[PDB]
Subunit: 106 residues, 3 copies
């Protein structure tokens, strides 16, 4: 899977979170999101393929995934305890970050 | 703004956690600390301004701020469980790491 | 410590978690694992010494340690809630990821 596939996986699991009812579905979708984000952090996005891996652009690209993962973790902690609608509301803020990172580097 | 202002934000929110009264204030201060630590991880400290962004020194700098981020996460997870005193005790460890990073990279 | 010693610390604390009785031991071993993974993010495997510190191989190395850190976080959050057995089960899968990362870069 490339970076685009990871972005698509993030978006699909965000859809699953939006269409979720219990906390187990939310937990599974958030674990999938974390795995996809960690896989995409290793990749080079299409916009930065003309840059060296040592460029500051790639460093900022990798650091943005830290914010992404912290938001994923906030949602996952809201889901681990019991609050499902709160986890969905937190993932609503997560979709903004996901799609902004997607459209910024594609 | 810059790395020094991020360190000042970290110190101010550490003092806020020290003077905190409930879990909401601790969580807010720790979220602000997480944001400031990410911003500082995106920055270049004064001592390392003569090093390339991909030098081992800068990599170790970003890893040290990752350590700070994980300690902030532990404090925030302790705060989300309603343990305000334990969250503040964990934030006492944050103060040592912040002071060490300040003295090491200023 | 270098990469091999950090991996050894990870494996020792995994064995401690496997043969743990209470939650405090699991939490202490997981904190040691977190410290070891964070420190190993600054290390270089002997077969990648000639490579660039920001080369895609080293990027995959550090982000694999990020994956380890997030799994450690899941185990530690399970242990904080008293779920010692779920934490041990998550540590079982964590050992698989540790062994995969070991076989990949050794
Ligand atoms: Bi938690
Ligand atoms: Co957590
Ligand atoms: Na880097």
């Amino acid at each position: 899977a490339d970076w685009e596939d990871n972005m698509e996986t993030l978006n699909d699991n965000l859809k699953v979170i939006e269409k979720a009812d219990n906390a187990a579905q939310v937990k599974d979708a958030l674990t999938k999101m974390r795995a996809a984000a960690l896989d995409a952090k290793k990749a080079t996005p299409p916009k930065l393929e003309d840059k060296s891996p040592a460029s500051p652009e790639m460093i900022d690209f990798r650091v943005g995934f830290d914010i992404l993962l912290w938001q994923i973790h906030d949602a996952l902690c809201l889901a681990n305890e019991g609050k499902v609608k709160e986890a969905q509301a937190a993932a609503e803020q997560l979709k903004t970050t996901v799609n902004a990172h997607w459209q910024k580097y594609r």
